[PDB]
């Protein structure tokens, strides 16, 4: 039922295409070769299905195999926060950062409530909705997602060390750089780096080259460990440093206090005099 359009980029696993549901609507299409190596697309599809119904969780319309590809068809979403960041001249107003922070914490909480961690929290994996959902932040891409507790007993996965970094180095938590198994705290710590990225326009560990990838990650790790939160966040409201310190002090199997983290930013929002009219920076482009 689906005509494949132009390739719009790559995902954590497989290629992404702008596509068309010939009968009705435009859609997004993810393809994975059915026989190249270890398969991933069908597991990710199963996670989306477990996530179904949650606020800001995309709907899948069909998932199967068509010839030489495993295919997943997703409702079309709007631009990613990295796209919108570029469109807003790579700087977000405080109001927009706080509006985004409120929803993004909630999306991460939702994923955690369904027993999974995302492990690649970054602007590219959050997309705005379209039409009646144009003010809603969605989260995408479960290719790196992992179950962190047992569905029946809620027994947390064990602590593990000497792991290779998974996800994007720019936003990875310090413990991830140190080879620790990722848990709920790490999704939230990554979000903290995303919010300061939006505030600052960059992070101080961006753009570092080296010979091998290990050395580059090592530079990023060292720069992150050697930059105190009060220096990273210098000049910005204290809530951002409070947020990051809170995430960095969580124990491996701690349940984060998502409400407290949201309340930090909500209190700031109201002390700044902003109104929750869901008018983001991009809503003001002329
Ligand atoms: C209507 O006018 C338009 C004008 C311009 C447009 O764009 C040029 C568009 C198209 C917008 C669009 O892209 N919409 C969209 C995308 C995704 C998606 C999937 C996806 C997932 C599952 C599926 F089944 C299908 C697609 N994967 C992703 N990965 N992004 C990554 C991954 C890894 C990275 F390191 C960085 C970024 N994305 C963004 C899902 C749903 N909607 C429209």
UniProtKB/Swiss-Prot annotation:
It comes from the Eukaryota. Changing residue 30 to M: Impaired kinase activity and abnormal subcellular localization with exclusive accumulation to the nucleus. It is found in: Cytoplasm; Nucleus; Cytoplasm, Cytoskeleton, Microtubule organizing center, Centrosome; Cytoplasm, Perinuclear region. Keywords: ATP-binding, Biological rhythms, Cell membrane, Cytoplasm, Cytoskeleton, Disease variant, Golgi apparatus, Kinase, Membrane, Methylation, Nucleotide-binding, Nucleus, Phosphoprotein, Serine/threonine-protein kinase, Transferase, Wnt signaling pathway. GO terms for molecular function: ATP binding; cadherin binding; protein kinase activity; protein serine kinase activity; protein serine/threonine kinase activity; tau-protein kinase activity. Residues 2-269 form the Protein kinase domain. Exhibits substrate-dependent heparin activation. Drug-mediated inhibition leads to a delay of the oscillations with the magnitude of this effect dependent upon the timing of drug administration. Inhibited by phosphorylation. Repressed by 3-[(2,4,6-trimethoxyphenyl)methylidenyl]-indolin-2-one (IC261), N-(2-aminoethyl)-5-chloroisoquinoline-8-sulfonamide (CKI-7), 4-[4-(2,3-dihydro-benzo[1,4]dioxin-6-yl)-5-pyridin-2-yl-1H-imidazol-2-yl]benzamide (D4476), 3,4-diaryl-isoxazoles and -imidazoles, and 4-(3-cyclohexyl-5-(4-fluoro-phenyl)-3H-imidazol-4-yl) pyrimidin-2-ylamine (PF670462, PF670). Essential serine/threonine-protein kinase that regulates diverse cellular growth and survival processes including Wnt signaling, DNA repair and circadian rhythms. It can phosphorylate a large number of proteins. Casein kinases are operationally defined by their preferential utilization of acidic proteins such as caseins as substrates. Phosphorylates connexin-43/GJA1, MAP1A, SNAPIN, MAPT/TAU, TOP2A, DCK, HIF1A, EIF6, p53/TP53, DVL2, DVL3, ESR1, AIB1/NCOA3, DNMT1, PKD2, YAP1, PER1 and PER2. Central component of the circadian clock. This is Casein kinase I isoform delta. The chain holds residues 8 to 294 of 415 of the full protein.
């Amino acid at each position: 039922r689906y005509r494949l359009g132009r390739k719009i980029g790559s995902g954590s696993f497989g290629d992404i295409y702008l596509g068309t549901d010939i009968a009705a609507e435009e859609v997004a299409i993810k393809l994975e070769c059915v026989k190249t190596k270890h398969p991933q697309l069908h597991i990710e599809s199963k996670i989306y299905k477990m996530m179904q119904g949650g606020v800001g969780i995309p709907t899948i319309r069909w998932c199967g195999a068509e010839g030489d590809y495993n295919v997943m068809v997703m409702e079309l979403l709007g631009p990613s926060l990295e796209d919108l960041f570029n469109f807003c001249s790579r700087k977000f107003s405080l109001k927009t950062v706080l509006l985004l922070a409120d929803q993004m914490i909630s999306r991460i909480e939702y994923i955690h409530s369904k027993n999974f961690i995302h492990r690649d929290v970054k602007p590219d994996n959050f997309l705005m909705g379209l039409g009646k959902k144009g003010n809603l932040v969605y989260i995408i891409d479960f290719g790196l997602a992992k179950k962190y507790r047992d569905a029946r007993t809620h027994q947390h996965i064990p602590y593990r060390e000497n792991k290779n970094l998974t996800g994007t180095a720019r936003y990875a938590s310090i413990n991830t750089h140190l080879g620790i198994e990722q848990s709920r705290r790490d999704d939230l710590e990554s979000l903290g780096y995303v919010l300061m990225y939006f505030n600052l326009g960059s992070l101080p560990w961006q753009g570092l080259k080296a010979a091998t990838k290990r050395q580059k990650y090592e530079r990023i790790s060292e720069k992150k460990m050697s930059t105190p939160i009060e220096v990273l966040c210098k000049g910005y409201p204290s809530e951002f440093a409070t947020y990051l310190n809170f995430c960095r002090s969580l124990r491996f199997d701690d349940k984060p206090d998502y409400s407290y983290l949201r309340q930090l930013f909500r209190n700031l929002f109201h002390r700044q005099g902003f109104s929750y009219d869901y008018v983001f920076d991009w809503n003001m482009l002329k």
